[PDB]
Write a protein that binds this ligand. Structure first.
Ligand SMILES: O=C(Nc1cc(-c2csc(=O)[nH]2)cc(S(=O)(=O)NC2CCCC2)c1)C1CC1
Length: 125
């Protein structure tokens, strides 16, 4: 397929954890970003067949999206907040990598990344 399987949202080999910061990442950070007007391209894995981006996964080797992040948070997949934050950063950087400066999709990611940074500036103790 043009599409690889989506990133795992569970892994029985990997230990689970719940922290105040991870709870906040789901309840506040993810769920607020999700409602932003520019969130829609990032709410699910890129479907290269649907979107006619046959080279997407030829270029992007560590795909990530907020649908996956949401499911990971719901499943207590992450060890800590930093691990989850890394997934958001991978999502943004993928967008900058696959596209180019000034593209509409990049303007969208830029705005979401700013809002994301505002929200993770302070996490609960
Ligand atoms: O996701 C959707 N559409 C969609 C997503 C992308 C995209 C997500 S991550 C990335 O790098 N690109 C891109 C497109 S596009 O080819 O049609 N370009 C558009 C997107 C915004 C500005 C130009 C579409 C719908 C939710 C499933």
């Amino acid at each position: 397929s043009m599409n690889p399987p989506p990133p795992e949202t569970s892994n029985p080999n990997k230990p689970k954890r719940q922290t105040n910061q991870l709870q906040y990442l789901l309840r506040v950070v993810l769920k607020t970003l999700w409602k932003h007007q520019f969130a829609w391209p990032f709410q699910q894995p890129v479907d290269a067949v649907k979107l006619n981006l046959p080279d997407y996964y030829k270029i992007i080797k560590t795909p990530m999206d907020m649908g996956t992040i949401k499911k990971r948070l719901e499943n207590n997949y992450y060890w800590n907040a930093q691990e989850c934050i890394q997934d958001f950063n991978t999502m943004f950087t993928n967008c900058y990598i696959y596209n180019k400066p000034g593209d509409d999709i990049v303007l969208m990611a830029e705005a979401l990344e700013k809002l994301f940074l505002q929200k993770i500036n302070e996490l609960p103790t």
